[PDB]
mmCIF file of C-alpha atoms in Angstrom:
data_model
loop_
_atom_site.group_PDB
_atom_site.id
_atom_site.type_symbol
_atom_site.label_atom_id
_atom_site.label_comp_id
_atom_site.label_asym_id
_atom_site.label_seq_id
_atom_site.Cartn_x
_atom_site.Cartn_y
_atom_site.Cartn_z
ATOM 1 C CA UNK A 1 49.292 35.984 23.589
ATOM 2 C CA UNK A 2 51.355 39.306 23.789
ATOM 3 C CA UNK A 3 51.389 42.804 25.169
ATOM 4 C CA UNK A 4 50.850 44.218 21.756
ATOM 5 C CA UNK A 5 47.030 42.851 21.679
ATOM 6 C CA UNK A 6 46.729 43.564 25.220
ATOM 7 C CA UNK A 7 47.799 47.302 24.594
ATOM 8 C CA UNK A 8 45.571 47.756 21.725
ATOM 9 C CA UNK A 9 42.222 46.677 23.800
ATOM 10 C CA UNK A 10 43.515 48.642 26.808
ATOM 11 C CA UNK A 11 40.628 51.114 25.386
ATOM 12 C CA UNK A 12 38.097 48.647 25.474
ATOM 13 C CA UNK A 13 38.890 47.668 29.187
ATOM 14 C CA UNK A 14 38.601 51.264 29.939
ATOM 15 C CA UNK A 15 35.211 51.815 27.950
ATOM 16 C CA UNK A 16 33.838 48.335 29.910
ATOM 17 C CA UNK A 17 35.325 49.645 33.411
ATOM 18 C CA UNK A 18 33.733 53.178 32.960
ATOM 19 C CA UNK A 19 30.264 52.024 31.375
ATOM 20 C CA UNK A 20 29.385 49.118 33.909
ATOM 21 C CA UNK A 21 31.816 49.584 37.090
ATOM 22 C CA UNK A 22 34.234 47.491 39.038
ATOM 23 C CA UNK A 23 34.252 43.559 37.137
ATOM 24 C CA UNK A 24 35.650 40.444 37.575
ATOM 25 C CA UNK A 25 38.578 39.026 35.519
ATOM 26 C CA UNK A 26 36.375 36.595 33.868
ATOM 27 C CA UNK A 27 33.682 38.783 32.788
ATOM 28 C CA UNK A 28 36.311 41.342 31.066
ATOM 29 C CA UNK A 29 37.824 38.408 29.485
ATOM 30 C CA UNK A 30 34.456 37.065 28.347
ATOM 31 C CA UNK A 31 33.447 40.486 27.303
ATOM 32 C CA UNK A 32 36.814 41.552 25.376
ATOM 33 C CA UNK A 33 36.384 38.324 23.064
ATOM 34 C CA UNK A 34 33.512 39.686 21.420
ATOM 35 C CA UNK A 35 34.168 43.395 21.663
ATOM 36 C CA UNK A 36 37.961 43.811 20.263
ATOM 37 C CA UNK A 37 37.926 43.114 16.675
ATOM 38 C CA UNK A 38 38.872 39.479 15.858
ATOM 39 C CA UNK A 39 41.955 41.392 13.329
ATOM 40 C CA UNK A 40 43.675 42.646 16.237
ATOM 41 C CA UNK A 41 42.792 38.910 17.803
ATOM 42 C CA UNK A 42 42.453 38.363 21.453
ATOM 43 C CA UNK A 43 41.124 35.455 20.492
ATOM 44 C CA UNK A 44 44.416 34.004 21.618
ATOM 45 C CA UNK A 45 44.567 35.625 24.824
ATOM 46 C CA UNK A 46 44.366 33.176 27.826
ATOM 47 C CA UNK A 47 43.131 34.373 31.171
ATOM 48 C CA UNK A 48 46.149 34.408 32.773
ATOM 49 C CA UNK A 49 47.829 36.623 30.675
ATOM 50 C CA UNK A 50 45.095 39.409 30.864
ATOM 51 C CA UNK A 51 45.449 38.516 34.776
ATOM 52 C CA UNK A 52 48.714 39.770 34.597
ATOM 53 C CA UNK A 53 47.821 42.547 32.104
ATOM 54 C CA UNK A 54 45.199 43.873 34.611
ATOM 55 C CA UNK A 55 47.344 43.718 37.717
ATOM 56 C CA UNK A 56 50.405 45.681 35.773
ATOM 57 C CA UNK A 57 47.653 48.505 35.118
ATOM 58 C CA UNK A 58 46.522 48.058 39.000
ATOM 59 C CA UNK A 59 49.886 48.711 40.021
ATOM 60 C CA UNK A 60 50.436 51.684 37.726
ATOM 61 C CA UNK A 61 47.559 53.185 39.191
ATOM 62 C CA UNK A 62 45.232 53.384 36.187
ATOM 63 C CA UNK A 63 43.091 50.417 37.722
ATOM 64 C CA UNK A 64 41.923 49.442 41.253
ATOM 65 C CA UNK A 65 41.667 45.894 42.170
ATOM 66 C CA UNK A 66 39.334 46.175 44.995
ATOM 67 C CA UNK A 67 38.793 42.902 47.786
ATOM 68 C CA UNK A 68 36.885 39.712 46.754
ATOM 69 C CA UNK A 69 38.182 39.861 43.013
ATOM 70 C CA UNK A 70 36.801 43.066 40.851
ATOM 71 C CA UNK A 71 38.840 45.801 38.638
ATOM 72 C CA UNK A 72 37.608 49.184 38.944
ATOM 73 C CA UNK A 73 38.995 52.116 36.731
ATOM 74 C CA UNK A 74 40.303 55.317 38.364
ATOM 75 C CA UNK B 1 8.195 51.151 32.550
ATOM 76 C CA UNK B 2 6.264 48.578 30.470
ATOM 77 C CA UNK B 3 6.622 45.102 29.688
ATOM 78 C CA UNK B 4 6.760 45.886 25.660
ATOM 79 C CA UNK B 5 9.665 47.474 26.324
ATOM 80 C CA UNK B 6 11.090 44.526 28.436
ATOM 81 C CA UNK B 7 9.954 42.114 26.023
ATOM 82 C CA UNK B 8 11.742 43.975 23.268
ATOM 83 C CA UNK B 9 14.977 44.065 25.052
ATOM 84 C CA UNK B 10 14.516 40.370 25.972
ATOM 85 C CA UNK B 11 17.243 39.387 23.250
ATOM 86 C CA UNK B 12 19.969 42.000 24.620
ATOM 87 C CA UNK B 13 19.709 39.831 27.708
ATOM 88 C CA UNK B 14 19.995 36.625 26.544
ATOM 89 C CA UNK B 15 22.933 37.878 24.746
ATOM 90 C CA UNK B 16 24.282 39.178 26.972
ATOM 91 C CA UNK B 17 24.353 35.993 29.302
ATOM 92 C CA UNK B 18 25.006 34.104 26.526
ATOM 93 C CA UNK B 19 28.103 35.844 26.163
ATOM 94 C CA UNK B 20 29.430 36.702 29.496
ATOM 95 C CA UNK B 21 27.742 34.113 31.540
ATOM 96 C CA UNK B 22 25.953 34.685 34.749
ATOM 97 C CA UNK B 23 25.409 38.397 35.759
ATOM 98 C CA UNK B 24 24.009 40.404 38.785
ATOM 99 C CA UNK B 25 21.177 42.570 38.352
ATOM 100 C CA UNK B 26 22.694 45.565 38.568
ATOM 101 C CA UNK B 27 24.903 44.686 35.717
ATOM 102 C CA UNK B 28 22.465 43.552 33.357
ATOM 103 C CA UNK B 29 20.819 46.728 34.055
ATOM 104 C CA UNK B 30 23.367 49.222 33.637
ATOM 105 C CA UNK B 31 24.198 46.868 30.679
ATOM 106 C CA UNK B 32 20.751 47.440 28.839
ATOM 107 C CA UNK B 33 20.928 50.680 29.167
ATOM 108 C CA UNK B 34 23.287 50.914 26.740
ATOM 109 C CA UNK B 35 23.229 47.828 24.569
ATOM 110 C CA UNK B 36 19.164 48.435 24.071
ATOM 111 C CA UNK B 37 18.615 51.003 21.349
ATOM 112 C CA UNK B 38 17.395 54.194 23.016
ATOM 113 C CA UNK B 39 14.571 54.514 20.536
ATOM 114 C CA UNK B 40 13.126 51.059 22.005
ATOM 115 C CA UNK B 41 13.728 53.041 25.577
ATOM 116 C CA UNK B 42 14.569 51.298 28.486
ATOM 117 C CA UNK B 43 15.838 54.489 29.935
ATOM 118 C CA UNK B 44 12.412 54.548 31.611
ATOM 119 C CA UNK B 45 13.055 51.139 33.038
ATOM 120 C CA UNK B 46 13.602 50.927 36.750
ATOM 121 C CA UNK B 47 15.698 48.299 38.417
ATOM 122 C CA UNK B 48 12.360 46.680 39.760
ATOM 123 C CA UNK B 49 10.812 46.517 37.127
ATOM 124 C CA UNK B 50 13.792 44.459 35.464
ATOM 125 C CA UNK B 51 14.041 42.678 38.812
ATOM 126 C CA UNK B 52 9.974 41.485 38.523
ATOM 127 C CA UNK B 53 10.481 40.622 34.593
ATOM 128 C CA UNK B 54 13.780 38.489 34.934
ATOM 129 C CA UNK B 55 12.132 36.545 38.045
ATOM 130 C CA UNK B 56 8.867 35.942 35.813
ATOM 131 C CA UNK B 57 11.428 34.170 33.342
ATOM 132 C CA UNK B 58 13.236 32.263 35.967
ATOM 133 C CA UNK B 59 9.910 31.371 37.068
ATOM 134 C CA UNK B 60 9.719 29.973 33.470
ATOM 135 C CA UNK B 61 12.584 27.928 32.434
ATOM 136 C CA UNK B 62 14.437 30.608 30.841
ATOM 137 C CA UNK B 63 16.569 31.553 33.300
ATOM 138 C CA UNK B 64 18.390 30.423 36.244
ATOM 139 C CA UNK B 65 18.535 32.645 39.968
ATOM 140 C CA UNK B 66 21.559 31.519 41.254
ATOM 141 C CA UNK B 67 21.987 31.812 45.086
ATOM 142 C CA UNK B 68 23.700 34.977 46.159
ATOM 143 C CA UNK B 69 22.509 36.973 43.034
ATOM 144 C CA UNK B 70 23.147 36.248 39.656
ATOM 145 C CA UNK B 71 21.515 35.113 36.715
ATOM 146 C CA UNK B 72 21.883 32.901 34.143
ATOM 147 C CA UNK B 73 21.087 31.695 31.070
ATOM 148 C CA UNK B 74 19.102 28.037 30.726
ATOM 149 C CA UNK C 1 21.003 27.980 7.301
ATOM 150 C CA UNK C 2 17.548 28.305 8.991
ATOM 151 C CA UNK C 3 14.899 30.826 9.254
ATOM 152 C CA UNK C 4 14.927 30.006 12.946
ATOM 153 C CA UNK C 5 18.439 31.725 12.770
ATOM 154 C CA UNK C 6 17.479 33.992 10.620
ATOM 155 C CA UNK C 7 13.992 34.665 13.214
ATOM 156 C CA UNK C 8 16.329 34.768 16.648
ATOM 157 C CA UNK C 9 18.699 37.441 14.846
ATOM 158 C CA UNK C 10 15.345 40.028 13.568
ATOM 159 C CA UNK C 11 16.011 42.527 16.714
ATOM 160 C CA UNK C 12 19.569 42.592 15.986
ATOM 161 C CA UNK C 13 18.764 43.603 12.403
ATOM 162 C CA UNK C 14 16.294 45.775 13.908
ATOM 163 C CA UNK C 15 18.490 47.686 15.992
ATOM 164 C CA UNK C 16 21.033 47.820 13.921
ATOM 165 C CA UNK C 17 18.806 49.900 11.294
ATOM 166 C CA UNK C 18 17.444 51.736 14.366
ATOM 167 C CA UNK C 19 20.876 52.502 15.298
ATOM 168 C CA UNK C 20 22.425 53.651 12.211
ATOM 169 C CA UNK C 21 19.386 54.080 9.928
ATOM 170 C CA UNK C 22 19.518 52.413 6.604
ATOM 171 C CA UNK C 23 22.510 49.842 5.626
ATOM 172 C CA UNK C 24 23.773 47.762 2.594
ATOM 173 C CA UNK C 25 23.246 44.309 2.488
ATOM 174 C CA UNK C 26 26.577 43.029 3.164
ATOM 175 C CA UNK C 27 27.141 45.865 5.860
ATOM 176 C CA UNK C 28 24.148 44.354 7.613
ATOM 177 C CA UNK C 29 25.411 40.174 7.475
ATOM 178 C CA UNK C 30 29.239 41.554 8.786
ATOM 179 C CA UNK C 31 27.576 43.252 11.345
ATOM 180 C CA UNK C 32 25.472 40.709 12.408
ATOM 181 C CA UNK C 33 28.108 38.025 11.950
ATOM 182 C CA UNK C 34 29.389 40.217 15.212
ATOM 183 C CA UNK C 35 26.601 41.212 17.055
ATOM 184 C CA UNK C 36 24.264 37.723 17.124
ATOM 185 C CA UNK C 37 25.559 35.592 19.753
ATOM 186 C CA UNK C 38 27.670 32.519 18.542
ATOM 187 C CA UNK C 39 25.748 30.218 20.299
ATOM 188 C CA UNK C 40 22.482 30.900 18.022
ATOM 189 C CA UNK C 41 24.809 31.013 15.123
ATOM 190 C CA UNK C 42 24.335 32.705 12.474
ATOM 191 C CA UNK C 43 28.036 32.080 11.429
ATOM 192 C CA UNK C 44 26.206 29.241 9.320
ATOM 193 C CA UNK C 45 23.903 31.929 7.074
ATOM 194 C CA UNK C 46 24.808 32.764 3.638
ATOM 195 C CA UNK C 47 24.337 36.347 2.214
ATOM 196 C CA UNK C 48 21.618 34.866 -0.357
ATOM 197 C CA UNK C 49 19.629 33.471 3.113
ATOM 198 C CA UNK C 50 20.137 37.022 4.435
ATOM 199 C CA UNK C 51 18.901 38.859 1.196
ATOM 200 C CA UNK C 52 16.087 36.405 1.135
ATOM 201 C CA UNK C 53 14.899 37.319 4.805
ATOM 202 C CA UNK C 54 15.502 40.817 4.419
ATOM 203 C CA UNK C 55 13.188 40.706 0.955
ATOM 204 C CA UNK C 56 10.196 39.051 3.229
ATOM 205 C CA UNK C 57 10.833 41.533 5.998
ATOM 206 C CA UNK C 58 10.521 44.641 3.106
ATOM 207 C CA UNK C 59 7.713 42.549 1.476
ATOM 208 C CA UNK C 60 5.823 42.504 4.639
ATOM 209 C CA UNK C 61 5.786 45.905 6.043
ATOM 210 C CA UNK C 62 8.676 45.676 8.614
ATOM 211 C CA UNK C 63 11.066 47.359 6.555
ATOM 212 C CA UNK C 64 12.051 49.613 3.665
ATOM 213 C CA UNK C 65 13.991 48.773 0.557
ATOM 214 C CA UNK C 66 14.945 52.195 -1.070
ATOM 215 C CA UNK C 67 16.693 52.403 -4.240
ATOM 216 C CA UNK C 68 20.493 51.770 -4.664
ATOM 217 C CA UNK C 69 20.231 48.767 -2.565
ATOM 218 C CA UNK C 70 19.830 49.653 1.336
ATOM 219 C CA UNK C 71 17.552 48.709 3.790
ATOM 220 C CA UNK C 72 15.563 51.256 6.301
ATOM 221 C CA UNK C 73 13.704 49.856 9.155
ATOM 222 C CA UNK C 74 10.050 50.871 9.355
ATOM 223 C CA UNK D 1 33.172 69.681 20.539
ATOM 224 C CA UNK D 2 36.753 68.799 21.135
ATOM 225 C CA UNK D 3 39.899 67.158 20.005
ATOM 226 C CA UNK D 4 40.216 65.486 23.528
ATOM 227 C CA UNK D 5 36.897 63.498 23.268
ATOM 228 C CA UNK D 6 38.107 62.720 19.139
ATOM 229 C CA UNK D 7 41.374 61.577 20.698
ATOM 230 C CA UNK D 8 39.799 58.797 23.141
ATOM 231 C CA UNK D 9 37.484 57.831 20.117
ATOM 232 C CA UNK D 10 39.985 57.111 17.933
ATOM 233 C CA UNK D 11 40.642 53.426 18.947
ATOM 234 C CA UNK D 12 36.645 52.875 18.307
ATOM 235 C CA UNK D 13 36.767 54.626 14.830
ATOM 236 C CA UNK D 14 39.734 52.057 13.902
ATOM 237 C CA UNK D 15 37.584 48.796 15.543
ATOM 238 C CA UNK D 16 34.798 49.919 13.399
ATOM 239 C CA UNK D 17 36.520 50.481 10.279
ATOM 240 C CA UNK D 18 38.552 47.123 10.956
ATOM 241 C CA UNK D 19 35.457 44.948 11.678
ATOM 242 C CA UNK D 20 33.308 46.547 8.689
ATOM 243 C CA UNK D 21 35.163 47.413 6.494
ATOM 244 C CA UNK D 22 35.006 51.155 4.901
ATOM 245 C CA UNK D 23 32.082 53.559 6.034
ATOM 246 C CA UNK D 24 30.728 56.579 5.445
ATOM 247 C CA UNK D 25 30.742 59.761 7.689
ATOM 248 C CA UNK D 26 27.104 59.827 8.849
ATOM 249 C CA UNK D 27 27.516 56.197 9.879
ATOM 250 C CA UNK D 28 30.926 56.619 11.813
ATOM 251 C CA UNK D 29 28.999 59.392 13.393
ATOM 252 C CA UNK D 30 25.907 57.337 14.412
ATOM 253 C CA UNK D 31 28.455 54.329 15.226
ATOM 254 C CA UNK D 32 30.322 56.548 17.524
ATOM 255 C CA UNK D 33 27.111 58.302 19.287
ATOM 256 C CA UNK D 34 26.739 54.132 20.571
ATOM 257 C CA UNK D 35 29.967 52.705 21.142
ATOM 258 C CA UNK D 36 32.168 55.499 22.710
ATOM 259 C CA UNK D 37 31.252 55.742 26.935
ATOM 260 C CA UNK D 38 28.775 58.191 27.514
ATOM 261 C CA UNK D 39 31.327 59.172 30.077
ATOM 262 C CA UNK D 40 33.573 60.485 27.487
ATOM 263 C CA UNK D 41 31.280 62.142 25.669
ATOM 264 C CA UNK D 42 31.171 62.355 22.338
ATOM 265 C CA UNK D 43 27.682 63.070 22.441
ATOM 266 C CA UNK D 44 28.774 66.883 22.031
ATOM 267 C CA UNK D 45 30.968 65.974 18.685
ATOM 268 C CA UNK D 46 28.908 67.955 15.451
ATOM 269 C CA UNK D 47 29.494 65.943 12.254
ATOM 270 C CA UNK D 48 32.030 68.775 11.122
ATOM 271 C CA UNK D 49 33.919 68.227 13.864
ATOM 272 C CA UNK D 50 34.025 64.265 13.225
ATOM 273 C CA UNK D 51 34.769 64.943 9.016
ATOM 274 C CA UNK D 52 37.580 67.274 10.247
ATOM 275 C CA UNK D 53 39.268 64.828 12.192
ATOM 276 C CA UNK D 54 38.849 62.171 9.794
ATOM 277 C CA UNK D 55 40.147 64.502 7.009
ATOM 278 C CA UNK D 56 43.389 64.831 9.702
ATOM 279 C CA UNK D 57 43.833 61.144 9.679
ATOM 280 C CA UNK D 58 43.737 60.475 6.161
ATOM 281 C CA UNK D 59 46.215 63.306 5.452
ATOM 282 C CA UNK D 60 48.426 61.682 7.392
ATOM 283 C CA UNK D 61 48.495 58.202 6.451
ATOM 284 C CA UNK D 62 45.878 56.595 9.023
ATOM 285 C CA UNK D 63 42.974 56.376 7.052
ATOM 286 C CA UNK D 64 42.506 56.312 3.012
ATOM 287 C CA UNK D 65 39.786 58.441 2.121
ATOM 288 C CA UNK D 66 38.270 56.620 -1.094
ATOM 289 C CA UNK D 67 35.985 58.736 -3.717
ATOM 290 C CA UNK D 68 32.104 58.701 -3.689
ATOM 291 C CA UNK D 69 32.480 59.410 0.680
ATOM 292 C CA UNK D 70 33.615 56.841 2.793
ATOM 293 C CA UNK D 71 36.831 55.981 5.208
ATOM 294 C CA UNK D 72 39.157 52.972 5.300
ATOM 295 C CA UNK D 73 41.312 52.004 7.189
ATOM 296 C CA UNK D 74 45.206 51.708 6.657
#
């Protein structure tokens, strides 16, 4: 539900981003509930607010969107 | 290369479709590569080779194509 | 509950000691509480199921008790 | 080989040590060798290297070291 989760699987985003490539907001979703350790939740984390998570981070310019719906790390 | 391999990393891709829902095949391969311990290989596993094995279980009822090219778990 | 459970989760307890090389008992049933896809459960199975399944896994030849209490895989 | 690669592992080492609970060096190590990108390294980190940094954290107040060898979390 809040930035403080989101900031503290930032370095799982990164890890996913860097070991598969560009993905799609669902599949990072999907893939962060099982990968960030239930303590630090994420478990209450609802798409939308990792939407905005992602795009903050794309507009920094630590992530690329990229056409048709995919984040890529830079 | 061989299908003992494949057949050993079978589970890593059901998981991993379990969990993240329908993937391309150059996900689930990049995917294996790291989720499959290196011991069991699958370094030596091409992308056609994966491509021939996951058809031979969509052929069986295990998995789903998916026009446009994704698969998924039955 | 079940030994299918217990049968679909063997490669995960298989990498796992391939992985990391030998592991306590209750090291091995967080682990796999994390690792086994919810779907197949596994959230269900007790640490006296697990011991039990380990035991027939060290009594056949598939892995290696060692003294102390942790298991290696053969 | 460097405190760089240690730095970027660090949020790993703390998921670990969350999800399982304390561990002991040689299994951070081997934990580490599977979970940190290849991208990032790590595969050049000696176990001195990883038992320094470790020894850094639980000076400060990080990690608690705990007799007989192995690392919890704080």
């Amino acid at each position: 539900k809040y930035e403080l989760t989101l900031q503290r699987s930032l370095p799982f985003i990164e890890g996913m981003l860097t070991n598969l490539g560009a993905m799609k907001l669902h599949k990072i979703h999907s893939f962060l509930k099982i990968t960030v350790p239930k303590d630090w939740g994420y478990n209450r984390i609802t798409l939308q607010q990792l939407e905005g998570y992602l795009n903050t981070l794309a507009d920094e310019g630590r992530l690329k969107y990229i056409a048709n719906g995919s984040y890529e790390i830079v």
